[PDB]
Structures are given as structure tokens and as C-alpha cells.
């Protein structure tokens, strides 16, 4: 059971990377902590003044998306897609403590690795000095893009499947239909939960959020809403096709 | 071997029936003409009063994206992803005459469905009044999003390809490699040609675009550059894997 315990750190102007650190030298900080060994986990607690119990939360990929508010910090449970023999969702914890943003998760969140890969491929130029409603914002924006993307390929799958119905009565069809129903269930439930996290973020006045960031989450809120309607529409599609392979046999 | 010839007719506030319509009954009208039988096309020129020749620009899918200036109208050629067993890109003309945005394409364009479908579900009236410096960008955006969807997707095939080389040579892999090169080559060329179109729209003051459209095309310009970068990044990766497939055997 390879457990990576990968941690990815960032900072002020511009283009930093580090581990055992000050972060008073930095405008903001993104520590992406990926699925830590029990030893590197405390390594983090020591560091950021965020306790492991408080942290162990954002590590439970079954945690319901939400926002918990300041003790020393802010917690946002968010849902990201989880890609496996069947696609699913999974929960990233995100803790914002003053100038530090942490992502903490059990499964890799492709949205994160993209920024990371991008971020390491990205020049000194791009301005995050707006950040940490901003950073958080992109993190959700990206995860969203993940959803948006999967839904786009799913609508792709629905199209092939529709002509594959000309075969009918098919063992494989019902099995793939449902598999797709499954993902669609995970999403709809998650984008709605995430929608409910977005709801607060586009509205609630927060130290972490500025108006400009608050502007974003309304976009992201309505985008997510886009994704929720679709999840449901693809669902409607699925049951209808489910109606066909039933009439064809079972 | 049909010519699918689907005339979609949309106008504010939100409804159908071309080949009787009175302009200036609406803010704007969106006519999408997909792969018309020239019976249906001639009718279209007649109604919109663009030279039947000038519309034929639009149906040429080899056309290099660009912006061309008035003969009684505006014209944008743009490269959008094209789907098959293997993916490439295909040109659509977009003509803007007064309040009429006409999107004309010989090949299906994934993005235009996604607006025609969105619109179907999308609510009516107030306010699309932002329309048609806006309407243009959205199509352009949805297209760009077509590309972005497939890159992040193609990226998957790359990760999945890295393993297949543990299986070593795989003339299969090599062809799959040449396949994803083929796709990428079209994207890169296309995103280049799109890019400039957007640099034009992002800069040049135009009757069809407003100040806000141009900022909106600037965003679109940015991601286009990302996509080119990814496309760049990805061909890179496929040059290596190929070199690899080759150090196996051949
Ligand atoms: Mg078929
Ligand atoms: Mg691997
Ligand atoms: Mg494998």
C-alpha cells in the first residue's frame, strides 16, 4: 500500500518552495498535504498550529462539505471527483489560517495536481497577491472544472450508449448504465453539498474572503448550479435508458 | 450520405421559426446553420442578405480562423474540436450582421449544441441584453472549453500510456502515440489560429464588441495560451514516449 505522504508548499513574490518554514516571509502559503503517513501528519501539526484532531477532519474523505469557522483557522470541506474502476467523489479538507492555505486529502484530487503541475510550470508573473480567497477560489474553480469535465465525457458516454440500445436486452448496458447512475449520484449529492459550501462563500462576509473573491464564488455557485442541473438531466436520461433495457429484458 | 442541414433559429426573447421572421422584433438572433443542403443555404442568404458565396466561407472547414471586415457584415472563422474515432479540429464561420449572430459550420461543433441545449433549458428574457459582443465570446468560450476538456482528457491517456511501456514496444502504443500526436498537432495549429483571432477581438475596437467583450476575450485569450501550452507540454511528452517506444524495438 504505497502511501505517498507528499506535501507541496508555496509562498510570496514570487515562485517559492519549501518545507520546514517561517511563512511570515510570505504573502500567502499553500501547503498541499497529500495522504500523510501518521508521522508526517504530526510534522504538520507542529508546524501550523493546527491540531491533528482539527486536521484529521479534512483527512476524512467521507466528511460532508461545509465550513467550520475560526478557532485558530477556517475549515472548508469540499467534494472533488474520485476516479477509479468507477468514478466517484472524495472530500478535500481546506484550512485557511491567516496567511496559510492548506489542502489535505486521502485521494489525489486531480484539480490540485493540475495547479501544482501548472504552478511548477508557471512563470513568476501570474499574480496571486490577491490571494487566499483567491487561491481557495481557484481550488474550487478547478475541482469544479473536474466535475464539469467528467459530466462532459459522461454526456459523451450517454450518446454512445443510446445507439448501443439498438442491441437491447444487454447485460453490459444495464451494468454500465448503473455505473453511470452511480457517478451521477455521487456528483449530484456532492455538487449540491459543494453548492451549499459555495452558497456561504459567495455571501458571508469573511476575513478570508474579500468582495472580489466573493464575486467569484457566485460565478462558481452558478457554474456548480449548471453542473447540478446536468447531473440531474443525465440522471433522467439514465433512467429512461434503464426503462429500455428493462423492456428489452430482465 | 445525407447533408444533415439543421437550421437552429434563436432570438431574444427566446424562440424559433426562421423563414418567416421580422428582425428588429428582437435585441439579437442566433442562427446556427449546420451542414446545409444548398437549397436551405440559398434561402438563408436570401433572408439574411449575405452573398451566397460569402456564406460558403463559413462552410469551409479547412478555413484558417481569422477576422475579416465588412462587406455588409462581420466574419469570424474559428477552429473548434472535431470528434471521430480520432480527434481533430474543424472550422466554422461566424457572421455578424447588425443584431444577427450566425454560426455556420459543415461539421458538428460540440459547443453550439451545448448552447442550443443550454438555451432550451435556460430561462427566458431578462437579461440576455448583454448580447452579441457577449454571444460571440460564449460560443468562442464553449469552443475553447471543448479544447480544454479534451486536453485534460488527452492528458489522461498519457498517464495511462506511461504504463503501457512497461509492457514495452507495443506497436499499438506507437500508433496510439502517433494518434495523440495527430490530435495535438491539429489543436496546436488551431489554438494558435484561434489565439490570434482572440488577440484581434481582445484589442481592436469593434462595433460588434464592447469594452467588456474585449476583457472577456482577454480571459479567453489567456486560456487559449494555456491550452497551447498544454498542447505544447503534451507533444513534448509524446516526443519522449515515442523515442521510448523506439528504444524498445523497431
Ligand atoms: Mg453507434
Ligand atoms: Mg503511473
Ligand atoms: Mg494501471
Swiss-Prot record, chains A, B:
Catalytic activity, as annotated: Mg(2+)(in) = Mg(2+)(out)
A molecular-function term among this protein's GO annotations: cobalt ion binding
Family recorded in the similarity comment: Belongs to the CorA metal ion transporter (MIT) (TC 1.A.35) family.
Major site of localization recorded for this protein: membrane
Record's subcellular location: Cell membrane
Record keywords: Cell membrane, Ion transport, Magnesium, Membrane, Transmembrane, Transmembrane helix, Transport
Membrane topology: Multi-pass membrane protein
SS bond partners: none
Regulation: Inhibited by cation hexaammines.
Record comment regarding domains: The central ion permeation pathway is formed by the first transmembrane domain from each of the five subunits. Mg(2+) binding strengthens interactions between subunits and leads to the formation of a symmetrical homopentamer surrounding a closed ion permeation pathway. Low cytoplasmic Mg(2+) concentrations trigger both a conformation change within each subunit and a loosening of the interactions between subunits. This results in an open ion conduction pathway. In addition, this results in a less symmetrical shape of the whole complex.
Biological function: Mediates influx of magnesium ions. Alternates between open and closed states. Activated by low cytoplasmic Mg(2+) levels. Inactive when cytoplasmic Mg(2+) levels are high.
Cytoplasmic side: 1-250
Native organism: Methanocaldococcus jannaschii (strain ATCC 43067 / DSM 2661 / JAL-1 / JCM 10045 / NBRC 100440)
Subunit structure: Homopentamer. In the absence of Mg(2+), interactions between subunits are weakened, and dimers, trimers and tetramers can be observed in vitro. Was initially proposed to be a homotetramer, based on the cross-linking studies. This is in contradiction with current 3D-structures that clearly show it is a homopentamer.
Cellular component, GO annotation: plasma membrane
Protein name: Cobalt/magnesium transport protein CorA
Keyword Transmembrane helix: yes
